[PDB]
Design an enzyme around this catalytic site. Structure first.
Site, short mmCIF file in Angstrom:
data_model
loop_
_atom_site.label_atom_id
_atom_site.label_comp_id
_atom_site.label_asym_id
_atom_site.label_seq_id
_atom_site.Cartn_x
_atom_site.Cartn_y
_atom_site.Cartn_z
N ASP A 195 29.56 3.43 68.83
CA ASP A 195 30.49 2.39 68.62
C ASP A 195 29.91 1.27 67.76
O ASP A 195 28.87 0.64 68.12
CB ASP A 195 30.86 1.78 70.01
CG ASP A 195 31.96 0.71 69.92
OD1 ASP A 195 33.16 1.12 69.83
OD2 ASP A 195 31.60 -0.49 69.85
N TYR A 210 29.48 -6.41 63.26
CA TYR A 210 28.13 -6.21 63.74
C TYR A 210 27.07 -6.26 62.66
O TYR A 210 25.90 -6.28 63.00
CB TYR A 210 27.98 -4.93 64.56
CG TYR A 210 28.95 -4.84 65.76
CD1 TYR A 210 29.63 -5.95 66.23
CD2 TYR A 210 29.11 -3.64 66.47
CE1 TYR A 210 30.52 -5.85 67.27
CE2 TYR A 210 29.99 -3.56 67.51
CZ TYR A 210 30.71 -4.66 67.94
OH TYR A 210 31.64 -4.54 68.97
N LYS A 217 35.74 -0.86 63.52
CA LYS A 217 36.75 -1.78 63.93
C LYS A 217 37.11 -2.66 62.73
O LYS A 217 36.22 -3.12 62.02
CB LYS A 217 36.34 -2.66 65.17
CG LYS A 217 35.80 -1.83 66.33
CD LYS A 217 35.51 -2.68 67.58
CE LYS A 217 34.69 -1.94 68.62
NZ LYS A 217 33.25 -2.00 68.37
N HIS A 260 40.19 -4.85 66.06
CA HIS A 260 39.10 -5.42 66.89
C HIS A 260 39.56 -6.49 67.87
O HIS A 260 39.11 -6.53 69.05
CB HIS A 260 37.98 -5.99 65.99
CG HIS A 260 36.64 -6.08 66.63
ND1 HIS A 260 35.50 -6.01 65.90
CD2 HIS A 260 36.24 -6.26 67.93
CE1 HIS A 260 34.44 -6.15 66.65
NE2 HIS A 260 34.87 -6.31 67.89
N1 LIG Z 1 35.43 -4.47 71.36
C1 LIG Z 1 34.78 -5.58 71.58
O1 LIG Z 1 35.41 -6.66 71.45
C2 LIG Z 1 33.42 -5.52 71.99
C3 LIG Z 1 32.78 -6.59 72.63
C4 LIG Z 1 31.51 -6.51 73.13
C5 LIG Z 1 30.81 -5.33 73.04
N2 LIG Z 1 31.40 -4.25 72.39
C6 LIG Z 1 30.68 -2.98 72.22
O2 LIG Z 1 30.24 -2.55 73.51
C7 LIG Z 1 28.82 -2.41 73.43
C8 LIG Z 1 28.07 -2.67 74.75
O3 LIG Z 1 28.50 -3.95 75.31
P1 LIG Z 1 27.42 -5.10 75.28
O4 LIG Z 1 26.63 -5.06 74.06
O5 LIG Z 1 28.10 -6.24 75.85
O6 LIG Z 1 26.20 -4.69 76.23
P2 LIG Z 1 26.08 -3.80 77.61
O7 LIG Z 1 26.12 -2.37 77.29
O8 LIG Z 1 26.85 -4.25 78.74
O9 LIG Z 1 24.61 -4.20 77.95
C9 LIG Z 1 23.54 -4.29 77.03
C10 LIG Z 1 22.36 -4.87 77.76
O10 LIG Z 1 21.98 -4.06 78.92
C11 LIG Z 1 20.65 -3.69 78.61
N3 LIG Z 1 20.51 -2.33 79.17
C12 LIG Z 1 20.93 -1.21 78.62
N4 LIG Z 1 20.64 -0.20 79.41
C13 LIG Z 1 20.01 -0.66 80.52
C14 LIG Z 1 19.51 -0.07 81.66
N5 LIG Z 1 19.51 1.23 81.84
N6 LIG Z 1 18.85 -0.80 82.62
C15 LIG Z 1 18.83 -2.12 82.39
N7 LIG Z 1 19.34 -2.80 81.29
C16 LIG Z 1 19.98 -2.02 80.35
C17 LIG Z 1 20.40 -3.92 77.08
O11 LIG Z 1 19.01 -4.15 76.83
P3 LIG Z 1 18.11 -3.19 75.97
O12 LIG Z 1 18.82 -3.09 74.62
O13 LIG Z 1 16.84 -3.96 75.95
O14 LIG Z 1 18.00 -1.96 76.82
C18 LIG Z 1 21.24 -5.17 76.73
O15 LIG Z 1 20.48 -6.39 77.11
C19 LIG Z 1 28.35 -3.28 72.24
O16 LIG Z 1 27.05 -2.93 71.75
C20 LIG Z 1 29.50 -3.01 71.24
O17 LIG Z 1 29.29 -1.67 70.70
C21 LIG Z 1 32.69 -4.35 71.93
C1 LIG Z 2 28.70 -12.62 64.72
C2 LIG Z 2 30.04 -12.24 65.06
C3 LIG Z 2 31.03 -12.58 64.16
C4 LIG Z 2 32.36 -12.29 64.37
C5 LIG Z 2 32.76 -11.60 65.54
C6 LIG Z 2 31.79 -11.25 66.46
N1 LIG Z 2 32.03 -10.60 67.66
C7 LIG Z 2 33.21 -10.42 68.27
C8 LIG Z 2 34.28 -11.33 68.19
C9 LIG Z 2 35.50 -11.17 68.84
C10 LIG Z 2 35.76 -10.00 69.55
C11 LIG Z 2 34.68 -9.05 69.68
C12 LIG Z 2 33.40 -9.22 69.06
C13 LIG Z 2 32.42 -8.21 69.28
O1 LIG Z 2 31.18 -8.51 69.36
O2 LIG Z 2 32.81 -7.04 69.41
C14 LIG Z 2 30.44 -11.58 66.23
C15 LIG Z 2 29.51 -11.22 67.16
#
Ligand SMILES: NC(=O)c1ccc[n+]([C@@H]2O[C@H](COP(=O)([O-])OP(=O)(O)OC[C@H]3O[C@@H](n4cnc5c(N)ncnc54)[C@H](OP(=O)(O)O)[C@@H]3O)[C@@H](O)[C@H]2O)c1
Ligand SMILES: Cc1cccc(Nc2ccccc2C(=O)O)c1C
Ligand code: NA
Length: 316
Positions: free
Chosen positions: A47, A52, A81, A114
């Site tokens: 993803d 990003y 996205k 997104h």
């Molecule tokens: N659609 C959206 O609006 C949106 C928003 C937010 C996120 N996302 C996507 O969803 C993804 C994941 O969500 P998120 O980035 O919020 O993070 P998350 O997956 O909830 O958590 C990441 C954290 O957990 C740690 N971690 C991972 N595996 C672990 C484990 N087994 N034991 C302990 N800690 C662990 C990571 O550290 P390390 O890297 O040090 O392991 C990082 O600090 C993003 O990377 C992005 O692709 C989408």
């Molecule tokens: C730095 C930057 C700039 C613009 C959008 C984002 N991130 C988001 C904004 C709104 C909704 C989701 C995200 C995301 O991180 O997926 C970031 C991290």
């Protein structure tokens, strides 16, 4: 072989996805190594997003693993996205094509809207006026969606979906006159402190898959997340279930999602944790264990995205 779910357009999505976002202080170079390690460990779903600022690195990782014979393109499910500076219909396809150029991929497997609040077009992803005000834009998301449809028909995106949509905004798409393709998914924050039962049921009723981000409790990156929010993975119930199973609280939180029918994302840039996370397919939770986890719900949203609050389409 690997565990997938059938989407409403007949394509298949691997049920565990690798998240690729890292805070700005982490060098982008790190995305390249992490995605290669995720592929080696058995992730088949990756993803990312234009916002990003890692599509170069993530695409190189994918192309490397294909070119060295590790994996076929058909066995990678790659999500991008559409950022909010490109909601205007005529800007949708160019934004997809720009991502595909950065990636040096021919198609994405899934393209999402997104975030439902629009911002002025341009290179800047959060455009501001001279007084620091976000430059919001007024765009009909049903038009944005017709543009997405066209990208699917063009073969540029195998499937299309949405992210951060609420019930109203989903209904707006589902009830659009002339709708060609439903969203295959709605990618939203979801974990045991915010389990999204209501929205999950609604998505189920429409055969839309809920895809969970921040499933491990998020990056906790300031200023996006309040440092005073509870740390998901320190939860005493998750930690006791982990101990019981000789697993980890992260694995419990991942497994919970899988069993309730949610496709789950997990970001890690750490080799050991990347390998650990795929162990989600090595164990199962009982009905009582699932109920215990359901009981943790506390209406804690980590990612309010409230710098985009004000406009009507703000979804929370
Ligand atoms: N659609 C959206 O609006 C949106 C928003 C937010 C996120 N996302 C996507 O969803 C993804 C994941 O969500 P998120 O980035 O919020 O993070 P998350 O997956 O909830 O958590 C990441 C954290 O957990 C740690 N971690 C991972 N595996 C672990 C484990 N087994 N034991 C302990 N800690 C662990 C990571 O550290 P390390 O890297 O040090 O392991 C990082 O600090 C993003 O990377 C992005 O692709 C989408
Ligand atoms: C730095 C930057 C700039 C613009 C959008 C984002 N991130 C988001 C904004 C709104 C909704 C989701 C995200 C995301 O991180 O997926 C970031 C991290
Ligand atoms: Na992340």
């Amino acid at each position: 072989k690997y565990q997938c779910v059938k989407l409403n357009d007949g394509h298949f999505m691997p049920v565990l996805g690798f998240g690729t976002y890292a805070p700005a202080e982490v060098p982008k170079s790190k995305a390249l190594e992490a995605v290669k390690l995720a592929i080696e460990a058995g992730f088949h779903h990756i993803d990312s997003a234009h916002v990003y600022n890692n599509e170069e690195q993530v695409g190189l990782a994918i192309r490397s693993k294909i070119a060295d014979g590790s994996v076929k393109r058909e066995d990678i499910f790659y999500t991008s996205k559409l950022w909010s500076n490109s909601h205007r219909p005529e800007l949708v396809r160019p934004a997809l094509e720009r991502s595909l150029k950065n990636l040096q991929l021919d198609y994405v497997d899934l393209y999402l809207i997104h975030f439902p609040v629009s911002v002025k077009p341009g290179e800047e992803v959060i455009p501001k006026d001279e007084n620091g005000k976000i430059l919001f834009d007024t765009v009909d998301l049903c038009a944005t969606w017709e543009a997405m449809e066209k990208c699917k028909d063009a073969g540029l995106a195998k499937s299309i979906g949405v992210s951060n949509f609420n019930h109203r905004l989903l209904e707006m798409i589902l009830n659009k006159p002339g709708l060609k393709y439903k969203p295959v998914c709605n990618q939203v924050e979801c974990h045991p402190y915010f389990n999204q039962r209501k929205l999950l049921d609604f998505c189920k009723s429409k055969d839309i898959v809920l895809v969970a981000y921040s499933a491990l409790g998020s990056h906790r990156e300031e200023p996006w997340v309040d440092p005073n929010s509870p740390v998901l993975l320190e939860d005493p119930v998750l930690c006791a279930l982990a101990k019981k199973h000789k697993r980890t609280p992260a694995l419990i939180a991942l497994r919970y999602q899988l069993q309730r029918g949610v496709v789950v994302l997990a970001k890690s840039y750490n080799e050991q944790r990347i390998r650990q996370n795929v162990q989600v397919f090595e164990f199962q939770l009982t009905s009582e264990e699932m109920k215990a986890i359901d009981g943790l719900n506390r209406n804690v949203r980590y990612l309010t995205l409230d710098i985009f609050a004000g406009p009507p389409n703000y979804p929370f």
